[PDB]
């Protein structure tokens, strides 16, 4: 069998764009590790992708992952867009590069490393780990130490 890991992720951003951060919690058989980092100018959606990326890339071997996230953007990309993109060479119907392609590709690579079951939570309430990653993400956004170098500035 694969070892089963629970992952909880969240992103947070003070503007659109603005300072932001991600938070993530990995749990194996009741033992936890946390990840977070803050970026000077990013978007909420990029931070939500980053949280999942960092969490998945931290795994040292193939695992079964229960990945819990409140992110509608990540949900929408995983369920609706990723399949099309891999078929179209990561281009829109219009033949241009998809928004946040750097991170989606990186997430797709990390996803192919493991057996992933997604649990789409509807809020932070009653989800103490998801509430904790929000706190980690907000805390990171209030102390940003890195640049989101892949963010193509739109304003």
């Amino acid at each position: 069998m694969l070892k089963q890991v629970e992952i909880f992720t969240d992103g947070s951003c003070l503007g659109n764009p603005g300072p932001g951060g991600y938070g993530a919690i990995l749990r194996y058989r009741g033992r936890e590790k946390t990840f977070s980092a803050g970026y000077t100018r990013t978007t909420n959606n990029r931070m939500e992708l980053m949280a999942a990326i960092v969490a998945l890339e931290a795994l040292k071997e193939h695992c079964e992952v229960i990945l819990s996230t409140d992110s509608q953007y990540v949900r929408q990309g995983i369920t609706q867009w990723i399949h099309n993109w891999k078929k179209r060479g990561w281009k829109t119907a219009d033949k241009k590069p998809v928004k946040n392609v750097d991170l989606w590709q990186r997430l797709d690579a990390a996803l192919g490393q493991h057996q992933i079951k997604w649990e789409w939570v509807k809020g932070h309430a009653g989800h103490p780990e998801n509430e904790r990653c929000d706190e980690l993400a907000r805390a990171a956004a209030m102390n940003p130490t890195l640049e989101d170098t892949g963010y193509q500035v739109e304003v």
């Binding site: 890991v5 194996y28 040292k60 071997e61």
Partner: peptide, 4 residues
């Protein structure tokens, strides 16, 4: 044994 912990995979992270």
């Amino acid at each position: 044994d912990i995979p992270f």
